DNA sequence: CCCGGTGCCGAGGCCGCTCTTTTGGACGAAGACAGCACAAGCACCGCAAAAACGCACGAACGCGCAGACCCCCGCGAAAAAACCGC
């Protein structure tokens, strides 16, 4: 990864791409950017795969297997403005000494997101039909995330 | 003062019974024992852990800047209803 300052990186990319005809690719069934975690404290991108969940953070990357997710809680905060999504993980995530058996995410209730799943029509029909929607309309981010987590981990949302 | 005779007390006889000691001399070898399990507490060593303090670092908030928005300010009109009277 290069950092090219100035208004310059797009021209640099175009020349390189044209030189060897580089073809862009798309991975991860679904990604959610800029999610606020209360525990661990910080902001994380959540990338979901068939067998595993990735949390990408500026200082810490975590790979959680879908089997290690024991429980999903979807709980409204009493402030009537934020919604909490809570993951119980076993083994608990580690940052050094004390650990994170619970991941606490905080959403705004008014935050809406539109998301298309990165799946082929044959794989969707065979594995995910009736578990996931092919496209989610502009609904609240925490609902889409809770449904995706339910479909991929096969855990009931509490 | 005297006679007839009987039933009452004495020191002793004797009978059936209960209590006591004893059961030959010398020698050898082997085998199994000879208070215990149980009890609370003293004086002491040790590990697991608390409430709080000290340090490091990463991100979400403040600061700074250029932009879009509508609260705020100012204006004029109409008359509901508040303040006064008997």
């Amino acid at each position: 990864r290069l950092y090219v300052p100035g208004q310059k990186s797009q021209l640099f990319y175009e020349q390189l791409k044209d030189k060897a005809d580089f073809d862009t690719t798309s991975e991860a069934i679904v990604s959610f950017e800029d999610i606020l975690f209360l525990t661990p404290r910080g902001r994380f991108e959540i990338s979901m795969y068939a067998n595993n969940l990735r949390l990408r953070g500026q200082s810490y990357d975590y790979k959680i297997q879908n089997k290690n997710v024991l429980r999903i809680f979807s709980l409204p905060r009493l402030d009537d403005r934020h919604h909490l999504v809570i993951l119980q993980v076993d083994p608990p995530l580690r940052q050094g000494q004390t650990r994170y058996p619970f991941l606490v995410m905080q959403f705004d209730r008014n935050e809406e997101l539109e998301v298309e799943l990165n799946l082929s029509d044959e794989e969707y029909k065979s594995k995910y039909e009736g578990k996931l929607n092919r496209s989610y309309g502009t609904d609240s981010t925490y609902k889409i995330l809770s449904h995706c987590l339910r479909g991929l981990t096969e855990r009931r949302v509490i």
Side-chain angles (χ1 to χ4, degrees), chain A residues 10 12 37 40 44 51 72-73 75 80-81 85 88 92 95-97 103 110 115-116 119 130 140 142 146:
Chain A
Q10 183 173 353
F12 181 89
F37 286 61
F44 296 88
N51 296 332
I72 305 159
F73 306 86
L75 302 176
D80 301 344
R81 185 173 176 176
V85 182
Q88 185 172 9
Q95 192 176 2
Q97 175 174 334
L103 309 173
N110 305 327
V115 185
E116 298 194 346
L119 291 170
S140 317
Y142 75 87
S146 298

Side-chain angles (χ1 to χ4, degrees), chain A residues 30 32 35 37 46-50 52-55 64-67 69 71-74 84-89 103 105 107 117 131-132 136 141-157:
Chain A
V30 57
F32 301 86
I35 296 177
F37 286 61
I46 304 187
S47 295
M48 309 196 171
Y49 306 88
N52 309 306
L53 179 78
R54 191 175 179 169
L55 310 176
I64 300 155
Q65 296 179 331
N66 292 349
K67 63 174 178 179
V69 182
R71 301 185 183 94
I72 305 159
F73 306 86
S74 185
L84 303 176
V85 182
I86 309 173
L87 300 177
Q88 185 172 9
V89 190
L103 309 173
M105 298 167 282
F107 297 90
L117 299 186
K131 296 183 183 177
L132 296 174
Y136 296 87
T141 304
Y142 75 87
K143 292 179 181 164
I144 298 173
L145 183 74
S146 298
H147 188 271
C148 291
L149 287 164
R150 180 182 170 193
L152 295 176
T153 69
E154 307 190 341
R155 302 307 189 189
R156 297 185 183 192
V157 182

Side-chain angles (χ1 to χ4, degrees), chain A residues 119-131 154:
Chain A
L119 291 170
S120 67
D121 292 343
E122 299 186 0
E123 288 175 326
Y124 178 77
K125 287 174 184 172
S126 59
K127 292 176 183 168
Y128 299 110
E129 188 168 6
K131 296 183 183 177
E154 307 190 341

Side-chain angles (χ1 to χ4, degrees), chain A residues 19-72:
Chain A
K19 278 193 172 193
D21 298 346
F22 296 124
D23 296 344
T24 69
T25 185
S26 297
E27 307 296 327
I29 304 182
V30 57
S31 54
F32 301 86
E33 297 181 9
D34 201 27
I35 296 177
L36 181 67
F37 286 61
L38 295 180
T39 294
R41 174 262 182 176
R43 229 98 174 189
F44 296 88
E45 182 203 347
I46 304 187
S47 295
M48 309 196 171
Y49 306 88
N51 296 332
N52 309 306
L53 179 78
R54 191 175 179 169
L55 310 176
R56 305 176 184 177
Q58 184 165 340
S59 312
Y60 298 96
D61 283 3
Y62 305 110
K63 188 172 186 166
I64 300 155
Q65 296 179 331
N66 292 349
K67 63 174 178 179
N68 296 357
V69 182
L70 296 185
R71 301 185 183 94
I72 305 159

